Protein backbone atom coordinates (compact mmCIF):
# COMPACT_ATOMS: atom_id res chain seq x y z
CA UNK A 1 0.00 0.00 0.00
CA UNK A 2 1.67 3.64 -0.44
CA UNK A 3 -0.06 6.94 -0.67
CA UNK A 4 -0.68 7.99 -4.44
CA UNK A 5 -4.43 8.86 -4.69
CA UNK A 6 -7.03 8.75 -7.86
CA UNK A 7 -5.32 6.61 -10.24
CA UNK A 8 -7.06 4.82 -12.56
CA UNK A 9 -5.35 1.21 -13.35
CA UNK A 10 -4.53 0.48 -16.71
CA UNK A 11 -2.04 -3.04 -16.20
CA UNK A 12 -0.86 -5.05 -13.03
CA UNK A 13 2.04 -1.89 -12.62
CA UNK A 14 0.86 1.08 -14.57
CA UNK A 15 -1.41 3.74 -13.42
CA UNK A 16 -2.60 7.39 -14.79
CA UNK A 17 -3.90 10.51 -13.40
CA UNK A 18 -4.88 13.90 -14.55
CA UNK A 19 -2.33 16.20 -12.78
CA UNK A 20 0.16 18.37 -12.00
CA UNK A 21 3.04 16.40 -11.54
CA UNK A 22 4.60 19.29 -9.41
CA UNK A 23 1.67 19.58 -7.47
CA UNK A 24 1.64 15.44 -7.00
CA UNK A 25 5.26 15.40 -6.01
CA UNK A 26 4.96 18.39 -3.54
CA UNK A 27 1.67 16.19 -1.89
CA UNK A 28 3.44 12.77 -1.66
CA UNK A 29 6.73 13.87 -1.62
CA UNK A 30 7.58 10.13 -3.41
CA UNK A 31 10.74 7.99 -2.79
CA UNK A 32 11.11 9.02 -6.83
CA UNK A 33 9.84 11.48 -9.21
CA UNK A 34 10.99 11.42 -12.78
CA UNK A 35 11.94 14.23 -14.73
CA UNK A 36 11.72 14.83 -18.23
CA UNK A 37 15.56 15.80 -18.53
CA UNK A 38 17.86 16.87 -21.63
CA UNK A 39 21.59 15.64 -21.82
CA UNK A 40 23.00 18.45 -20.30
CA UNK A 41 19.86 18.93 -17.68
CA UNK A 42 18.89 22.60 -18.28
CA UNK A 43 15.79 22.59 -17.04
CA UNK A 44 14.01 25.59 -19.04
CA UNK A 45 10.42 24.45 -19.78
CA UNK A 46 8.14 21.59 -19.57
CA UNK A 47 7.96 19.34 -16.99
CA UNK A 48 11.76 19.51 -16.31
CA UNK A 49 11.11 23.93 -16.10
CA UNK A 50 8.49 23.63 -13.87
CA UNK A 51 9.96 20.81 -11.60
CA UNK A 52 13.14 23.03 -11.50
CA UNK A 53 10.96 25.96 -10.85
CA UNK A 54 9.14 24.29 -7.79
CA UNK A 55 12.99 23.72 -6.05
CA UNK A 56 13.47 27.44 -6.20
CA UNK A 57 16.15 26.53 -8.93
CA UNK A 58 18.39 24.03 -6.88
CA UNK A 59 17.62 21.38 -8.83
CA UNK A 60 19.37 23.21 -11.84
CA UNK A 61 22.24 24.45 -9.40
CA UNK A 62 22.62 20.37 -8.26
CA UNK A 63 22.44 19.74 -11.91
CA UNK A 64 25.03 22.11 -13.59
CA UNK A 65 27.94 20.43 -10.78
CA UNK A 66 26.58 16.92 -12.15
CA UNK A 67 27.40 17.83 -15.70
CA UNK A 68 30.50 19.77 -15.03
CA UNK A 69 31.67 16.52 -13.31
CA UNK A 70 30.42 13.69 -15.56
CA UNK A 71 29.14 15.57 -18.85
CA UNK A 72 26.41 15.03 -20.83
CA UNK A 73 23.72 11.68 -20.26
CA UNK A 74 22.74 9.40 -23.24
CA UNK A 75 19.67 10.19 -25.31
CA UNK A 76 17.58 6.94 -23.53
CA UNK A 77 19.90 7.37 -20.16
CA UNK A 78 19.47 8.67 -16.65
CA UNK A 79 20.74 9.91 -13.85
CA UNK A 80 19.56 10.32 -10.18
CA UNK A 81 19.86 13.14 -8.07
CA UNK A 82 18.39 14.56 -4.69
CA UNK A 83 14.23 15.37 -5.14
CA UNK A 84 15.02 18.16 -2.95
CA UNK A 85 11.87 19.49 -1.55
CA UNK A 86 9.41 17.02 -3.78
CA UNK A 87 10.93 13.79 -3.36
CA UNK A 88 13.21 11.91 -1.75
CA UNK A 89 15.21 11.25 -5.18
CA UNK A 90 14.53 12.71 -8.87
CA UNK A 91 15.32 10.41 -11.50
CA UNK A 92 16.32 12.39 -14.60
CA UNK A 93 15.74 10.55 -17.97
CA UNK A 94 16.29 11.39 -21.27
CA UNK A 95 13.59 10.39 -24.15
CA UNK A 96 14.09 11.39 -27.24
CA UNK A 97 12.86 15.03 -28.53
CA UNK A 98 11.62 14.49 -31.92
CA UNK A 99 11.91 18.56 -32.40
CA UNK A 100 15.52 17.50 -32.66
CA UNK A 101 15.34 14.75 -34.72
CA UNK A 102 16.32 12.30 -32.17
CA UNK A 103 15.23 8.71 -32.94
CA UNK A 104 11.65 7.71 -31.02
CA UNK A 105 13.03 4.21 -31.10
CA UNK A 106 15.22 5.45 -27.98
CA UNK A 107 11.97 5.90 -26.04
CA UNK A 108 12.17 2.20 -24.84
CA UNK A 109 15.75 2.37 -23.43
CA UNK A 110 14.84 5.60 -21.77
CA UNK A 111 11.79 3.83 -19.95
CA UNK A 112 14.01 0.61 -19.13
CA UNK A 113 16.18 3.12 -16.67
CA UNK A 114 12.65 2.76 -14.64
CA UNK A 115 12.87 -0.67 -13.68
CA UNK A 116 15.70 0.45 -11.53
CA UNK A 117 13.33 1.92 -8.87
CA UNK A 118 10.44 -0.22 -7.22
CA UNK A 119 7.71 2.65 -7.33
CA UNK A 120 8.33 5.91 -9.33
CA UNK A 121 6.41 9.34 -9.97
CA UNK A 122 6.83 10.01 -13.64
CA UNK A 123 5.28 12.15 -16.62
CA UNK A 124 5.03 10.48 -20.35
CA UNK A 125 8.61 10.21 -21.55
CA UNK A 126 8.82 12.26 -25.45
CA UNK A 127 5.76 13.86 -24.60
CA UNK A 128 4.83 17.77 -24.77
CA UNK A 129 7.71 20.17 -26.04
CA UNK A 130 9.49 16.69 -26.73
CA UNK A 131 7.13 16.14 -29.66
CA UNK A 132 6.46 12.68 -29.78
CA UNK A 133 2.74 10.70 -29.69
CA UNK A 134 2.13 10.57 -25.98
CA UNK A 135 -0.66 7.87 -26.85
CA UNK A 136 2.32 6.04 -28.36
CA UNK A 137 4.59 6.96 -25.17
CA UNK A 138 1.82 5.39 -22.72
CA UNK A 139 2.38 2.29 -25.06
CA UNK A 140 5.92 2.13 -25.06
CA UNK A 141 5.88 2.85 -20.82
CA UNK A 142 3.04 0.01 -20.53
CA UNK A 143 4.96 -2.38 -22.45
CA UNK A 144 8.51 -1.81 -21.01
CA UNK A 145 8.24 -0.41 -17.30
CA UNK A 146 7.56 -3.52 -14.95
CA UNK A 147 8.03 -1.87 -11.72
CA UNK A 148 4.83 0.36 -9.81
CA UNK A 149 4.72 3.32 -11.75
CA UNK A 150 2.47 6.47 -11.19
CA UNK A 151 1.94 8.62 -14.44
CA UNK A 152 0.85 12.34 -14.43
CA UNK A 153 -0.85 13.95 -17.44
CA UNK A 154 -1.10 17.44 -16.90
CA UNK A 155 -3.51 18.16 -19.69
CA UNK A 156 -7.17 17.26 -19.06
CA UNK A 157 -8.09 16.67 -22.48
CA UNK A 158 -5.02 14.79 -23.06
CA UNK A 159 -5.78 12.50 -19.87
CA UNK A 160 -9.27 11.59 -21.44
CA UNK A 161 -7.79 10.58 -24.94
CA UNK A 162 -5.15 8.57 -23.45
CA UNK A 163 -7.71 6.68 -21.30
CA UNK A 164 -10.52 6.20 -23.95
CA UNK A 165 -7.87 4.66 -26.31
CA UNK A 166 -6.10 2.85 -23.84
CA UNK A 167 -5.83 -0.93 -25.61
C1 LIG B 1 1.61 17.90 -23.46
C2 LIG B 1 2.03 17.82 -21.99
C3 LIG B 1 0.73 17.86 -21.19
C4 LIG B 1 2.95 18.94 -21.61
C5 LIG B 1 3.25 18.92 -20.12
N1 LIG B 1 3.69 17.65 -19.52
C6 LIG B 1 3.47 17.56 -18.11
N2 LIG B 1 2.93 16.42 -17.59
C7 LIG B 1 2.72 16.35 -16.24
N3 LIG B 1 2.99 17.29 -15.34
C8 LIG B 1 3.52 18.43 -15.86
N4 LIG B 1 3.89 19.55 -15.13
C9 LIG B 1 4.39 20.49 -16.03
C10 LIG B 1 4.34 19.96 -17.30
C11 LIG B 1 3.79 18.64 -17.24
C12 LIG B 1 3.50 16.42 -20.35
C13 LIG B 1 4.83 15.62 -20.48
O1 LIG B 1 4.54 14.53 -21.31
C14 LIG B 1 2.84 16.55 -21.74
Known amino acids: VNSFSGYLKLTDNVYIKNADIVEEAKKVKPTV ?3 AAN ?5 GGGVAGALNKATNNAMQVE ?4 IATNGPLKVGGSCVLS ?9 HVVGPNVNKGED ?3 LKSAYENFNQHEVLLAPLLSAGIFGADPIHSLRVCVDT ?14 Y ?4 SSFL
Do not use: E, M, P, W
Open 160 to 163: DKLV
Open 33 to 35: VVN
Open 145 to 158: VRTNVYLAVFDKNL
Open 39 to 43: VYLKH
Open 63 to 66: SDDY
Open 83 to 91: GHNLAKHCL
Open 104 to 106: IQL
